[PDB]
């Protein structure tokens, strides 16, 4: 519908009526990703989920369990530590379906490198286990 | 609420009035993720941030530092 300059009040009202549906669906949803502080990482189900303190609830109420994202299938990378910051996406905008990834902050600072662009610096505070079935 | 095919103009308008709030909040925002070209990766603060050339500004202006 090209609602041009020559339009009646009814045509404009019809344009608004036919268009506000996506915004109605957006009501009670989470549109953007958020930044949050990890407060709990002991997942009793062993699913590597963490609990966060998102600014929406002002650390008053505890949130739901938030599931991790990996770059590879059989990679189980170290989890974020307590008080570390992560970025959280919400699948279908649902607050109860959250998926996280840690970011570089200060509780998560940058590692020392000779070349910050090309070098790779990795530290593991626990055990490191790599298994390769092929060569 | 449920606005059916048996509704009046005033209610059609009122429904739009209350449900347009989220669309109003979306104004001057970036709803979807974008694809961009990295133009600067030398971060003076050592925070591993990069500068991009997003298509919105057509490479005419530079952007802000973007965190990893």
């Amino acid at each position: 519908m090209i609602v041009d300059e020559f339009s009646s009040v009814y045509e404009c009202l019809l344009y608004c009526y036919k268009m506000v549906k996506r915004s109605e669906q957006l009501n009670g949803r989470r549109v953007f990703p958020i930044l949050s502080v990890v407060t709990n990482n002991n997942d009793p189900e062993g699913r590597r989920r963490v609990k966060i303190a998102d600014p929406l609830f002002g650390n008053l109420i505890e949130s739901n369990w938030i599931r991790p994202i990996r770059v590879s299938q059989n990679q189980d990378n170290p989890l974020p530590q307590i008080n570390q910051m992560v970025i959280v996406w919400f699948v279908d905008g649902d607050s109860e379906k959250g998926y996280y990834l840690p970011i570089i902050n200060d509780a998560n600072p940058s590692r020392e490198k000779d070349d910050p662009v090309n070098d790779s610096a990795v530290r593991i505070e626990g055990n490191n286990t790599i298994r390769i079935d092929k060569n | 609420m449920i606005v059916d095919e048996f509704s009046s103009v005033y209610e059609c308008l009122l429904y739009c009035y209350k449900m347009v709030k989220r669309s109003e909040q979306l104004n001057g925002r970036r709803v979807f993720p974008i694809l961009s070209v990295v133009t600067n990766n030398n971060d003076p603060e050592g925070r591993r941030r990069v500068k991009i050339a997003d298509p919105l500004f057509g490479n005419l202006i530079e952007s802000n530092w973007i965190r990893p």
Partner: peptide
């Protein structure tokens, strides 16, 4: 006055049903 105020709703309402039916 109120009679006509109402008649006016009836008109505006039906005019805006006309627009609903007038559009693809």
């Amino acid at each position: 006055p109120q009679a006509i105020a109402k008649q006016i709703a009836d008109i505006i309402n039906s005019q805006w049903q006309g627009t609903l039916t007038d559009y693809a």
